[PDB]
Amino acid sequence: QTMALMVSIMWLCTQSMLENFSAAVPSHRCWAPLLDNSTAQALSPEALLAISIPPGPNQRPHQCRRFRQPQWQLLDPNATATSWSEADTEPCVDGWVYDRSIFTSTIVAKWNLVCDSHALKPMAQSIYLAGILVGAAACGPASDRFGRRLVLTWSYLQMAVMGTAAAFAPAFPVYCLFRFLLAFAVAGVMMNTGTLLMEWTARARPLVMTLNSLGFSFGHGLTAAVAYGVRDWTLLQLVVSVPFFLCFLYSWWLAESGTLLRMPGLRFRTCISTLCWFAFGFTFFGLALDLQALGSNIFLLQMFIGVVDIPAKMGALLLLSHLGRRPTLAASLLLAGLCILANTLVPHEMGALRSALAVLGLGGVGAAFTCITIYSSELFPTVLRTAVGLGQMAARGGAILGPLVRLLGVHGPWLPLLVYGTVPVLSGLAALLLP
Numbered sequence: 001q002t003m004a005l006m007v008s009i010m011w012l013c014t015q016s017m018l019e020n021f022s023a024a025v026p027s028h029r030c031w032a033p034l035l036d037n038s039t040a041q042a043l044s045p046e047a048l049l050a051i052s053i054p055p056g057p058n059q060r061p062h063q064c065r066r067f068r069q070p071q072w073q074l075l076d077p078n079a080t081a082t083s084w085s086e087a088d089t090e091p092c093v094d095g096w097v098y099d100r101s102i103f104t105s106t107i108v109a110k111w112n113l114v115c116d117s118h119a120l121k122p123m124a125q126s127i128y129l130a131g132i133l134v135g136a137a138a139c140g141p142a143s144d145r146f147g148r149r150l151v152l153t154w155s156y157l158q159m160a161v162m163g164t165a166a167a168f169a170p171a172f173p174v175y176c177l178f179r180f181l182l183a184f185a186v187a188g189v190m191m192n193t194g195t196l197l198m199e200w201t202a203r204a205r206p207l208v209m210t211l212n213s214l215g216f217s218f219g220h221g222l223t224a225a226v227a228y229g230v231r232d233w234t235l236l237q238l239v240v241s242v243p244f245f246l247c248f249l250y251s252w253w254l255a256e257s258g259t260l261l262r263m264p265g266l267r268f269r270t271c272i273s274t275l276c277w278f279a280f281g282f283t284f285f286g287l288a289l290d291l292q293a294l295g296s297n298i299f300l301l302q303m304f305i306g307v308v309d310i311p312a313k314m315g316a317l318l319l320l321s322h323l324g325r326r327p328t329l330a331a332s333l334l335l336a337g338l339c340i341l342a343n344t345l346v347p348h349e350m351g352a353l354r355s356a357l358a359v360l361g362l363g364g365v366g367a368a369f370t371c372i373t374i375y376s377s378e379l380f381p382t383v384l385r386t387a388v389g390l391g392q393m394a395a396r397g398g399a400i401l402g403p404l405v406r407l408l409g410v411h412g413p414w415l416p417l418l419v420y421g422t423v424p425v426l427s428g429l430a431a432l433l434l435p
């Protein structure tokens with residue numbers, strides 16, 4: 001039944017989207033005796049916060065620097081503000097503290113993922129995406145030798161185990177290994193679902209593809225509701241991996257008891273296919289893992305994209321079945337690129353338009369993925385359509401560089417968004433050349 005796998009793919013989106021909710025960075029500041037010690041001191045907490053922490057970006061108190069001595073210059077109204085020296089700051093010798101405003105417990109507050117060592121979150125995202133990448137390649141021969149159903153049940157068991165274990169990870173490398181194994185199992189489940197849905201009924205390939213895509217997009221609203229319900233990342237991972245226990249228990253019928261040579265050239269087809277897959281994967285896994293910076297509220301943005309991705313994909317399927325594959329794919333790619341470029345150009349003051357443009361770009365890249373998945377079954381002969389596997393591998397490899405590009409934010413907050421807007425434009429400009 002397609003319902004059982006559709007539910008699993010829905011929770012698979014939840015497990016994939018948990019990389020953004022669990023790695024959320026709430027408002028944090030360094031430990032200070034004027035704010036964290038006893039109230040009896042030798043009033044006005046904002047003044048103490050200002051005199052204890054030097055200002056940083058967006059006129060906010062810095063998150064990785066603290067004054068070695070109380071700077072009373074920010075207290076006297078007649079004093080010249082913004083005139084202290086750099087030597088009066090210390091590299092946070094007393095640690096940091098976290099405010100439980102939007103989130104009460106995350107992996108950032110546990111292992112101290114402050115901006116001083118902010119590379120740990122993109123590194124963990126890249127490790128998860130590498131586990132997704134190597135998961136599809138290794139599960140190929142595993143499903144070919146052991147069978148798709150047995151390895152599917154084993155991947156469900158591994159998903160449950162690594163979900164119940166990641167919530168109890170005491171160290172950062174242990175959590176990274178748990179996420180790697182979880183991503184391996186996720187990639188195995190995805191490959192099995194893909195190889196089963198294609199050979200299920202298919203002329204009915206686009207219908208089942210759109211159904212699976214809608215079941216996956218339901219995962220956005222699912223994880224939004226779960227993150228609005230529970231606020232602890234451990235309890236979140238637990239309740240997200242709980243349904244996979246029943247998914248594994250669904251085994252045994254509910255307790256019954258191809259290589260090619262491209263020496264002359266790229267032949268104008270596989271190069272463009274891999275380029276579009278790379279672009280889709282890169283923009284998707286670079287824009288979905290940083291939803292906190294794309295809108296004012298993470299849950300609101302998630303609900304918005306979850307409620308907009310369904311009619312967007314419906315219209316994408318409509319244009320795919322009504323006016324072809326290449327023109328609608330190029331149009332969706334260009335629309336997503338222009339939307340991300342406008343989101344980059346629009347200042348951070350207008351949050352509503354920013355969230356709308358981000359939702360439109362995500363819908364556009366989803367429509368482009370749907371089109372390139374429908375187009376992958378027609379651009380190659382019946383025996384060459386290895387092509388879909390190569391395209392998925394190229395998309396995963398492009399996703400690998402997704403979180404790594406976000407590290408370029410030290411030079412400017414718009415450069416990652418600039419790339420996320422420029423890549424779809426070139427992808428759509430190159431998509432028009434498809435036969």
Ligand SMILES: CC(C)(Sc1ccncc1-c1ccc(C#N)c2ccccc12)C(=O)O
Pocket residue numbers: 009013016132190212213216281284366369370392395396399
């Ligand atoms: C690696 C991906 C993008 S898959 C994938 C891997 C891990 N987390 C989520 C997805 C995913 C992303 C967008 C989708 C859409 N639309 C989608 C639909 C069905 C199953 C997975 C996804 C590929 O194969 O290139």
